[PDB]
Amino acid sequence: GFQKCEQLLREYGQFCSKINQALHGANLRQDDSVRNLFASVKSSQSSP
Amino acid sequence: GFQKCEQLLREYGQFCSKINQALHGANLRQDDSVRNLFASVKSSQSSPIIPGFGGDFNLTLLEPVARSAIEDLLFDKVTIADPGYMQGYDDCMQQGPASARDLICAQYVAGYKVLPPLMDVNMEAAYTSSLLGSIAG
Amino acid sequence: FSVDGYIRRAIDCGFNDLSQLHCSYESFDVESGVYSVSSFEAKPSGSVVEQAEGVECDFSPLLSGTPPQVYNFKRLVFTNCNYNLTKLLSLFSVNDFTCSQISPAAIASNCYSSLILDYFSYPLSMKSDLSVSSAGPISQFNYKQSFSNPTCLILATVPHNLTTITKPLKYSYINKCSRLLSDDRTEVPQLVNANQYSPCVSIVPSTVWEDGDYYRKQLSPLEGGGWLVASGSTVAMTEQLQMGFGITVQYGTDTNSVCPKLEFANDTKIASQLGNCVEYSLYGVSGRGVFQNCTAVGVRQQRFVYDAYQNLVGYYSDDGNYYCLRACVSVPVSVIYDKETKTHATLFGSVACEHIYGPLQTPVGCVLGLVNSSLFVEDCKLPLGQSLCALPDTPGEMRLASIA
Amino acid sequence: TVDVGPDSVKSACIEVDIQQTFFDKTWPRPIDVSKADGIIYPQGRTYSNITITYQGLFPYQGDHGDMYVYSAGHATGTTPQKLFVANYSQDVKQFANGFVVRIGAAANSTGTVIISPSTSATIRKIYPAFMLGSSVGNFSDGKMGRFFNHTLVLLPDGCGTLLRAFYCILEPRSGNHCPAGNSYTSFATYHTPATDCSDGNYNRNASLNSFKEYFNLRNCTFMYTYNITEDEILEWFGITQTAQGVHLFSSRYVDLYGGNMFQFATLPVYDTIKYYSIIPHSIRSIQSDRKAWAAFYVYKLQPLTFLLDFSVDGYIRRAIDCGFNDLSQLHCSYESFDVESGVYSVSSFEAKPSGSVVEQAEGVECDFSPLLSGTPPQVYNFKRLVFTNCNYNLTKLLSLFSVNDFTCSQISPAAIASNCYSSLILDYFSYPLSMKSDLSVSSAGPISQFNYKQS
Amino acid sequence: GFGITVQYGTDTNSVCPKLEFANDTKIASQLGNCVEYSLYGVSGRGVF
Amino acid sequence: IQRLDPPEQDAQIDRLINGRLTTLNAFVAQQLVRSESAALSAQLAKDKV
Amino acid sequence: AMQTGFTTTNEAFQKVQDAVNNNAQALSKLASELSNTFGAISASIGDIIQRLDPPEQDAQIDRLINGRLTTLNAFVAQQLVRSESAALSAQLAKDKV
Numbered sequence A: 001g002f003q004k005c006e007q008l009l010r011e012y013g014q015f016c017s018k019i020n021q022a023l024h025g026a027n028l029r030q031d032d033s034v035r036n037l038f039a040s041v042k043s044s045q046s047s048p
Numbered sequence B: 001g002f003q004k005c006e007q008l009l010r011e012y013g014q015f016c017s018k019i020n021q022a023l024h025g026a027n028l029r030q031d032d033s034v035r036n037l038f039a040s041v042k043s044s045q046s047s048p049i050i051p052g053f054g055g056d057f058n059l060t061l062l063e064p065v066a067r068s069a070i071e072d073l074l075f076d077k078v079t080i081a082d083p084g085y086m087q088g089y090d091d092c093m094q095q096g097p098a099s100a101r102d103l104i105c106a107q108y109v110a111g112y113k114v115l116p117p118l119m120d121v122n123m124e125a126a127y128t129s130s131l132l133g134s135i136a137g
Numbered sequence C: 001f002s003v004d005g006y007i008r009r010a011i012d013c014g015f016n017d018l019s020q021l022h023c024s025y026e027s028f029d030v031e032s033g034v035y036s037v038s039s040f041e042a043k044p045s046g047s048v049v050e051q052a053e054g055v056e057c058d059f060s061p062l063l064s065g066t067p068p069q070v071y072n073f074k075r076l077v078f079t080n081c082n083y084n085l086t087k088l089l090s091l092f093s094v095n096d097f098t099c100s101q102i103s104p105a106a107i108a109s110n111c112y113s114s115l116i117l118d119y120f121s122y123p124l125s126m127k128s129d130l131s132v133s134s135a136g137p138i139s140q141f142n143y144k145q146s147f148s149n150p151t152c153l154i155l156a157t158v159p160h161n162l163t164t165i166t167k168p169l170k171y172s173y174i175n176k177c178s179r180l181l182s183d184d185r186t187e188v189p190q191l192v193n194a195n196q197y198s199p200c201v202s203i204v205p206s207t208v209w210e211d212g213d214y215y216r217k218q219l220s221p222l223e224g225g226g227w228l229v230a231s232g233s234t235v236a237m238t239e240q241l242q243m244g245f246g247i248t249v250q251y252g253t254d255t256n257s258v259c260p261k262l263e264f265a266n267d268t269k270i271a272s273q274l275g276n277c278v279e280y281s282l283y284g285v286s287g288r289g290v291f292q293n294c295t296a297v298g299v300r301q302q303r304f305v306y307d308a309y310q311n312l313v314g315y316y317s318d319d320g321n322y323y324c325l326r327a328c329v330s331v332p333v334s335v336i337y338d339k340e341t342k343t344h345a346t347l348f349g350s351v352a353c354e355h356i357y358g359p360l361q362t363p364v365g366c367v368l369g370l371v372n373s374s375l376f377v378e379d380c381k382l383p384l385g386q387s388l389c390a391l392p393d394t395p396g397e398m399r400l401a402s403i404a
Numbered sequence D: 001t002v003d004v005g006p007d008s009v010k011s012a013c014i015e016v017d018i019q020q021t022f023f024d025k026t027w028p029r030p031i032d033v034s035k036a037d038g039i040i041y042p043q044g045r046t047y048s049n050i051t052i053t054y055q056g057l058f059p060y061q062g063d064h065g066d067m068y069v070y071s072a073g074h075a076t077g078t079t080p081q082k083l084f085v086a087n088y089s090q091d092v093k094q095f096a097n098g099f100v101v102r103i104g105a106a107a108n109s110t111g112t113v114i115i116s117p118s119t120s121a122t123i124r125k126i127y128p129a130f131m132l133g134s135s136v137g138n139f140s141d142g143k144m145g146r147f148f149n150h151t152l153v154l155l156p157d158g159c160g161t162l163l164r165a166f167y168c169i170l171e172p173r174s175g176n177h178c179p180a181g182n183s184y185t186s187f188a189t190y191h192t193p194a195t196d197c198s199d200g201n202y203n204r205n206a207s208l209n210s211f212k213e214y215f216n217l218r219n220c221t222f223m224y225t226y227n228i229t230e231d232e233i234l235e236w237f238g239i240t241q242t243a244q245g246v247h248l249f250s251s252r253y254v255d256l257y258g259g260n261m262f263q264f265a266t267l268p269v270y271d272t273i274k275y276y277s278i279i280p281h282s283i284r285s286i287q288s289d290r291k292a293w294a295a296f297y298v299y300k301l302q303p304l305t306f307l308l309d310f311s312v313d314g315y316i317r318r319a320i321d322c323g324f325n326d327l328s329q330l331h332c333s334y335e336s337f338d339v340e341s342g343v344y345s346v347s348s349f350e351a352k353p354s355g356s357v358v359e360q361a362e363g364v365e366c367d368f369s370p371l372l373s374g375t376p377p378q379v380y381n382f383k384r385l386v387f388t389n390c391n392y393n394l395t396k397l398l399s400l401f402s403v404n405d406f407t408c409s410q411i412s413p414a415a416i417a418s419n420c421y422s423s424l425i426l427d428y429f430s431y432p433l434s435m436k437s438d439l440s441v442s443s444a445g446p447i448s449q450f451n452y453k454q455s
Numbered sequence E: 001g002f003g004i005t006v007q008y009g010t011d012t013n014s015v016c017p018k019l020e021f022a023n024d025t026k027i028a029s030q031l032g033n034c035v036e037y038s039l040y041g042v043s044g045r046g047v048f
Numbered sequence F: 001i002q003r004l005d006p007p008e009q010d011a012q013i014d015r016l017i018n019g020r021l022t023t024l025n026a027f028v029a030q031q032l033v034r035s036e037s038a039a040l041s042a043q044l045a046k047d048k049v
Numbered sequence G: 001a002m003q004t005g006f007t008t009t010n011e012a013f014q015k016v017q018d019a020v021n022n023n024a025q026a027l028s029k030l031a032s033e034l035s036n037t038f039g040a041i042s043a044s045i046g047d048i049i050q051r052l053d054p055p056e057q058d059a060q061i062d063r064l065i066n067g068r069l070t071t072l073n074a075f076v077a078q079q080l081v082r083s084e085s086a087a088l089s090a091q092l093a094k095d096k097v
């Protein structure tokens, strides 16, 4: 939250955009991994 | 190109040798990966693809038009920048960048180069075309 | 280096692309393959320069009448003019001229968005009180230089024959500046900000009458209430008036139109060098590139057109034309090397041969050292890309073969 | 100093009627950043056909600002009387980083004559007048709005054809209804269309002359005028201040129809502007010719990051205030106005302090008395006073000596006198000033090598 | 000559400028709130 | 900020920035390595089911 | 039914576009990082040299070097990660054929 720091941070480019996008993609990857995995465990027919 | 910088860069050791060797190895890896993959798709024996291949089964989608119709559609629908393998250097000078953040023209400015793939398009098409003709048999 | 330490063999690592390869692996023997090496650089064929040319920046005010005290320094702001520091420095006996965050050579030679000159009377005996590290009264309550912009400080004595500058009776300064809050228990020192005036300037007279004078103002509620107070102090006047000059320069808020004057050659014009790689200096903006005549984009009044990566990509010239600016572009280089034959070929990927047996144009770029063979291989060891392969003659030249 | 013409020779000012109720209107026009309202173009450059973020002084998305409206004065048929104003001169605002003004937004709409609510008229653009400065207080009768020392006045004149900017000392006149006289309410400027706005020769000093009825202008350092071509087009005006002076921005000289503001002037005003006010203006129209004047809106600027959409022609037509909300933060992080659907993490909503708590040792003063009694030691025998658990005051000690050189290292000057410490160690000794440099860290002389060295 | 050396954290930072205290800067009066704090030279933000 | 003026204050803040930027880059690099590994592993789980 | 399937609802199709986007992102790191100053007075070496003398000029150039060396190390690390992944994937493709 310090403005002086934020001012200096800006000189490193869109650093935080890269951090957020990299993690966003990495997190989507698990939702996709899970969705695919369960779609395959799922039975068509099953007994109670 | 600044000599003062290069003089200071030297004090970091053979930094650039490491960058180049790491990428060289990484790039060889794809040529080896591709060579191995296609060696395995390759058929020993195959039937010719003729119009009408498939009989009552409509395979025109897959028949070479040469890439197949579905294959061309797949490529046409994906937005891919043209790397300019034959003369991109010049396209970026006589026309300039296609848009903001043009990463192909950036190559000659930033100091990086996109290298061509191991096989051209017609060869890759030949491999999957011969594969198609081998399926039934 | 041999066992006995003598050098018997060497590689000049900048001679050619093959030599660069050997140096990058620090060996005289490298394996066969196709390797990327440093690009063949485009080099400047000339230069283009545009600078504001016109009115001199006017330092006359400085030279007429009694200079202000340090807390009342006067400011001359120079924009869109030709500066010459020697012109001003030569009129004073300079005692101490130092620069910070800019070199000495640069202060007198670079272009700026603005040059700000702060001048005042100042005893030389208090020289150190203007130091950045100082915790004395001048740096805390009277005058402080920017920490962000490059600055210079000049301390100089007015010559006996510079009769246009008169002397104050004494040098003076604020040694205290503070606010008394409404409770009248808490006193808060009011420190001067860089490039600003102390809040106590309005209560302190242009000359402190005598050392120890105390000043006070009742503040309104809009000013936070309470009292603003200050104390003055004095220094006896010297035979010759001593003056301080602060210089602050900014590098990119506007066109950098504050420049040394330059005599221009007509071979430094842009129109006369279109299509060439040139060095440029345009109102302080510099780099290397190729200018092209093209359709105007962006706001004309702003002169310099930038892209999304902050590169300069266009420019509106004072000759009325808009030019596109392209980087001088390097020419890609890959070395095709065969260890067994000790032969090589050079690939300029993505480059038409118009920029380079003569050269052979291939689907992957222009290649020197290869001869077109109309031969097919399956067994390719030196793939070039697409379905091309370099095939050694075995030694002769490498052949350009197609992969079957 | 600058000659700004003669003083007014009138013995009295025109009486001013302040009736704020009539000016308490709700005509909201908040900043719409998506329409690029209030934007000052990046100053040293242009861009074309790109979307980028940019750091600079911008108004906040959704800011309503402060609305001000000028009106017609009182009349009786063909003889204008008393001026009619809002309580603007007394409403002094903090300048901070400056402001932008929306001018003439309501032009061409049917509006109201403020002085006569039942009377409608076509709305015409009117330019704002401002008084800015370093210090404020009250007038002789206790009313606020007095500016001290040099005050910057931005006063449109010529019935809206020129902007006159001057920096001068305003000396209240003592005549009837003037700020240093009797029956004072508020100062105001005015023009009288009947004599001042002839189709041909407009009176370029009409507003200056009315200003001069309330104040004498003294020690003016400058007076500049800028020309305005007349139209009814919405325009933006802005003011900021840097070490280079006061910067005046406007959309009309570069992007008239678009609204982006570009700098048109820099004024040699170097003291810091801390306060500003709107100079109320009243038009001395006849009763039968009252016009509706457009309200102007003042919005404050602050250092914000905006996403700016630069068109091919370089103008900013669309923008995002990246701190407005979480959705805006998303657009800025991708530097785009169009991002894909999904669930994204954005900056957290910060908790902010609601106050402060302080505990300090409070008690005994740290005692510097030893220092002041007897012959100080030589530099190699320096004496040490160690202060712990006490209240220090360096001024108390410094004020007893004529300080020749006081410098600090690895601590700022402001900090040495204001921070708390585990301990403060004071080493004192006799020392010739002629050997000053021998105490430098970089010194290789005898003092630093064999006598005394700092941590 | 007068040398001054200061240390910042070997003990409670009890060598302070004198301060006139308001009773709204007490901890007990602001429990549960987010406040800035300065406690014998130690500072930051938090909730007591 | 409380102890130093801008020319030195800047250098000190900058050290903290470099260290924290480094930490975040390392973190992200590992989340990408770990998520790639978990994804491959998930396909193994798919095959076993 | 598949002829019109290369759309927004086709997961396999987006994976094709994403592979493409990943190549673009890899290149954008190099294109976009040269404009950073990494605390330096300018991203331009030429500006540093033109404005400063060696004892300070050195420090400023060095900031740019550290930032660029860091960028290249990050780039290479990712090309190695991405090429390792693609190679494993290629063996999966081999098995599927």
Ligand SMILES: *[C@@H]1O[C@H](CO)[C@@H](O[C@@H]2O[C@H](CO)[C@@H](O[C@@H]3O[C@H](CO[C@H]4O[C@H](CO)[C@@H](O)[C@H](O)[C@@H]4O[C@H]4O[C@H](CO)[C@@H](O)[C@H](O)[C@@H]4O)[C@@H](O)[C@H](O[C@H]4O[C@H](CO)[C@@H](O)[C@H](O)[C@@H]4O[C@H]4O[C@H](CO)[C@@H](O)[C@H](O)[C@@H]4O)[C@@H]3O)[C@H](O)[C@H]2NC(C)=O)[C@H](O)[C@H]1NC(C)=O
Residues within 6 Å of the ligand: C084, C085, C086, C087, C090, C260, C261, C262
């Ligand atoms: C930035 O600002 C600085 C300061 O304003 C500028 O620097 C000045 O630049 C001018 C030139 O533009 C320069 O003038 C030169 O001065 C020398 C010195 O001569 C003096 O001493 C001799 C002693 O024999 C006297 O004879 C002579 O009259 C001068 O005396 C001065 O002092 C006495 C008191 O002691 C006074 O009574 C005098 O009146 C006078 O003030 C001159 O020798 C030199 O002359 C040459 O150039 C002129 C150009 O007009 C030409 O007419 C002469 O014939 C002669 O030229 C020939 O010789 C040169 C080689 O020297 C050759 O190249 C030519 O082809 C000819 O063969 C001239 O007058 C002044 O001293 C500088 N001052 C400082 C402080 O640096 C700087 O230029 C500005 N920068 C920019 C970019 O604008």
Ligand SMILES: *[C@@H]1O[C@H](CO)[C@@H](O[C@@H]2O[C@H](CO)[C@@H](O[C@@H]3O[C@H](CO[C@H]4O[C@H](CO)[C@@H](O)[C@H](O)[C@@H]4O[C@H]4O[C@H](CO)[C@@H](O)[C@H](O)[C@@H]4O)[C@@H](O)[C@H](O[C@H]4O[C@H](CO)[C@@H](O)[C@H](O)[C@@H]4O[C@H]4O[C@H](CO)[C@@H](O)[C@H](O)[C@@H]4O)[C@@H]3O)[C@H](O)[C@H]2NC(C)=O)[C@H](O)[C@H]1NC(C)=O
Residues within 6 Å of the ligand: C176, C180, C184, C187, C212, C214, C216, C227, C229, D393, D394, D395, D396, D399, E017, E018, E019
């Ligand atoms: C750290 O250590 C430093 C140094 O010890 C502390 O700073 C000192 O702080 C005290 C206040 O606590 C401050 O005293 C003030 O001095 C001024 C100056 O007046 C002198 O000049 C006038 C000229 O007209 C004389 O009339 C006056 O007598 C003084 O003369 C002095 O010098 C002559 C020789 O030339 C001697 O003969 C004299 O004896 C004398 O030494 C005073 O004007 C000021 O008075 C106001 O405050 C007192 C409080 O007791 C009050 O009684 C007065 O009526 C008056 O208050 C009214 O006005 C104020 C606005 O100014 C308003 O707020 C009130 O409400 C009232 O309306 C007082 O005496 C001393 O000068 C400072 N010294 C230095 C070097 O800075 C610092 O405070 C310490 N820090 C901490 C945190 O403790």
Ligand SMILES: *[C@@H]1O[C@H](CO)[C@@H](O[C@@H]2O[C@H](CO)[C@@H](O[C@@H]3O[C@H](CO[C@H]4O[C@H](CO)[C@@H](O)[C@H](O)[C@@H]4O)[C@@H](O)[C@H](O[C@H]4O[C@H](CO)[C@@H](O)[C@H](O)[C@@H]4O)[C@@H]3O)[C@H](O)[C@H]2NC(C)=O)[C@H](O)[C@H]1NC(C)=O
Residues within 6 Å of the ligand: C201, C202, C203, C204, C205, C206, C217, D148, D149
């Ligand atoms: C920034 O702006 C502020 C506010 O306008 C200025 O402060 C004002 O300063 C003036 C003078 O500089 C004050 O006016 C009067 O100053 C007199 C000084 O006395 C000497 O000079 C006069 C000159 O004729 C001689 O006659 C006299 O013998 C002395 O040699 C005071 O004596 C006046 O006092 C009167 O009013 C007080 C009010 O309490 C009465 O008690 C007295 O008996 C007497 O009637 C008067 O003070 C003026 O008052 C200041 N205003 C305020 C609000 O404080 C700043 O100077 C200006 N700053 C700069 C840097 O320009």
Ligand SMILES: *[C@@H]1O[C@H](CO)[C@@H](O[C@@H]2O[C@H](CO)[C@@H](O[C@@H]3O[C@H](CO[C@H]4O[C@H](CO)[C@@H](O)[C@H](O)[C@@H]4O)[C@@H](O)[C@H](O[C@H]4O[C@H](CO)[C@@H](O)[C@H](O)[C@@H]4O)[C@@H]3O)[C@H](O)[C@H]2NC(C)=O)[C@H](O)[C@H]1NC(C)=O
Residues within 6 Å of the ligand: D104, D105, D106, D107, D108, D231, D232, D233, D234, D257
């Ligand atoms: C009160 O009422 C007045 C009029 O009664 C309005 O003033 C008009 O405002 C509009 C919009 O701002 C102006 O329209 C613009 O005119 C520009 C130039 O017009 C001059 O040049 C053209 C060249 O052919 C002439 O045909 C024209 O007659 C003028 O001589 C155009 O360049 C602008 O187009 C630009 O912006 C549009 C916006 O979408 C783009 O689409 C275009 O591609 C281009 O970028 C635009 O057409 C109009 O001229 C003004 N009238 C007058 C007399 O000047 C006031 O705005 C209104 N006030 C309020 C508060 O509503």
Ligand SMILES: *[C@@H]1O[C@H](CO)[C@@H](O[C@@H]2O[C@H](CO)[C@@H](O[C@@H]3O[C@H](CO)[C@@H](O)[C@H](O[C@H]4O[C@H](CO)[C@@H](O)[C@H](O)[C@@H]4O)[C@@H]3O)[C@H](O)[C@H]2NC(C)=O)[C@H](O)[C@H]1NC(C)=O
Residues within 6 Å of the ligand: D002, D003, D004, D005, D006, D204, D205, D208, D222, D223, D224, D225
């Ligand atoms: C309307 O407002 C304008 C402001 O825009 C104001 O303009 C001022 O007019 C006066 C003259 O009336 C100018 O002052 C003159 O400037 C010239 C410049 O060369 C001087 O030479 C003149 O000096 C002669 O006259 C003096 C009169 O006292 C003598 O004292 C002197 O010895 C000379 O004889 C004189 O200084 C002034 O500069 C402009 N100001 C600006 C900012 O342009 C105009 O007067 C106003 N009109 C009315 C009717 O009020």
Ligand SMILES: *[C@@H]1O[C@H](CO)[C@@H](O[C@@H]2O[C@H](CO)[C@@H](O[C@@H]3O[C@H](CO)[C@@H](O)[C@H](O)[C@@H]3O)[C@H](O)[C@H]2NC(C)=O)[C@H](O)[C@H]1NC(C)=O
Residues within 6 Å of the ligand: B058, B059, B060, B061, B069, G003
């Ligand atoms: C085998 O399948 C292919 C498609 O996979 C069939 O060919 C398709 O036939 C339709 C006729 O209804 C063509 O439609 C035409 O499209 C054009 C597009 O502009 C339109 O202008 C025409 O009016 C008409 O709608 C379709 O394009 C065509 N596709 C291809 C790839 O040729 C083919 O007929 C099937 N074969 C058998 C034996 O059924």
Ligand SMILES: Nc1nc(=O)c2nc(CNc3ccc(C(=O)N[C@@H](CCC(=O)O)C(=O)O)cc3)cnc2[nH]1
Residues within 6 Å of the ligand: D026, D027, D028, D029, D030, D069, D106, D110, D111, D112, D113, D114, D123, D292, D293, D294, D295, D296
């Ligand atoms: N002399 C005079 N000057 C004027 O400026 C003026 N303006 C009006 C009309 N002013 C306005 C301004 C805004 C809206 C308006 O439509 N506001 C929206 C809300 C906008 C928002 O908050 O986002 C509304 O629905 O009320 C209406 C009338 C009428 N008489 C006048 N008379």
Ligand SMILES: *[C@@H]1O[C@H](CO)[C@@H](O[C@@H]2O[C@H](CO)[C@@H](O)[C@H](O)[C@H]2NC(C)=O)[C@H](O)[C@H]1NC(C)=O
Residues within 6 Å of the ligand: B099, D049, D312
């Ligand atoms: C301004 O930028 C837009 C991109 O946002 C350009 O529009 C692209 O133009 C190319 C031309 O080949 C098309 O292939 C793209 O599909 C277009 N993209 C979009 C989003 O429409 C536009 O042409 C640019 N304008 C100028 C004058 O350069």
Ligand SMILES: *[C@@H]1O[C@H](CO)[C@@H](O[C@@H]2O[C@H](CO)[C@@H](O)[C@H](O)[C@H]2NC(C)=O)[C@H](O)[C@H]1NC(C)=O
Residues within 6 Å of the ligand: D020, D024, D087, D088, D090, D091
């Ligand atoms: C001048 O008039 C304005 C507007 O009527 C006053 O501002 C209002 O003050 C009341 C006080 O309770 C607030 O409730 C309103 O919300 C304020 N209005 C706005 C728009 O902020 C202002 O205080 C008056 N100033 C003086 C000096 O009399």
Ligand SMILES: *[C@@H]1O[C@H](CO)[C@@H](O[C@@H]2O[C@H](CO)[C@@H](O)[C@H](O)[C@H]2NC(C)=O)[C@H](O)[C@H]1NC(C)=O
Residues within 6 Å of the ligand: D001, D169, D218, D219
């Ligand atoms: C404003 O200007 C005047 C004149 O240029 C300054 O000088 C005073 O002028 C008055 C005029 O009646 C004289 O009575 C004073 O004796 C003059 N004082 C001096 C020192 O000569 C006046 O000082 C200027 N004011 C400011 C604040 O700069």
Ligand SMILES: *[C@@H]1O[C@H](CO)[C@@H](O[C@@H]2O[C@H](CO)[C@@H](O)[C@H](O)[C@H]2NC(C)=O)[C@H](O)[C@H]1NC(C)=O
Residues within 6 Å of the ligand: D204, D226, D227
């Ligand atoms: C601002 O507008 C005024 C008024 O149009 C210009 O002053 C006129 O200049 C012409 C030039 O020939 C004279 O003939 C007129 O007599 C002047 N009018 C007055 C009232 O003095 C003024 O020059 C314009 N300013 C700028 C910077 O263009």
Ligand SMILES: CC(=O)N[C@H]1[C@H]([C@H](O)[C@H](O)CO)O[C@@](O)(C(=O)O)C[C@@H]1O
Residues within 6 Å of the ligand: D019, D022, D073, D074, D075, D076, D084, D115, D116, D117, D118, D287
């Ligand atoms: C502010 C004010 O008092 N306005 C009043 C005006 C003026 O007295 C006249 O316009 C004088 O010219 O008169 C009214 O009858 C009117 O016109 O509606 C009532 C209105 O409240």
Ligand SMILES: *[C@@H]1O[C@H](CO)[C@@H](O)[C@H](O)[C@H]1NC(C)=O
Residues within 6 Å of the ligand: C159, C160, C161
């Ligand atoms: C001032 O000018 C006179 C003129 O003769 C000269 O003699 C004197 O030495 C000059 N003084 C200085 C300090 O230059």
Ligand SMILES: *[C@@H]1O[C@H](CO)[C@@H](O)[C@H](O)[C@H]1NC(C)=O
Residues within 6 Å of the ligand: C266
């Ligand atoms: C270019 O410079 C030469 C130098 O003598 C001059 O003769 C020629 O006239 C110049 N050309 C123009 C167009 O000014």
Ligand SMILES: *[C@@H]1O[C@H](CO)[C@@H](O)[C@H](O)[C@H]1NC(C)=O
Residues within 6 Å of the ligand: C271, C293, C294, C321
């Ligand atoms: C640039 O191009 C425009 C039109 O395309 C033309 O009229 C102008 O003269 C050209 N300028 C130069 C320097 O060739």
Ligand SMILES: *[C@@H]1O[C@H](CO)[C@@H](O)[C@H](O)[C@H]1NC(C)=O
Residues within 6 Å of the ligand: C360, C361, C362, C363, C372, C373, C374, C400
């Ligand atoms: C080599 O020569 C043959 C002629 O048959 C030509 O078709 C082929 O394109 C040539 N290759 C290159 C790279 O020029």
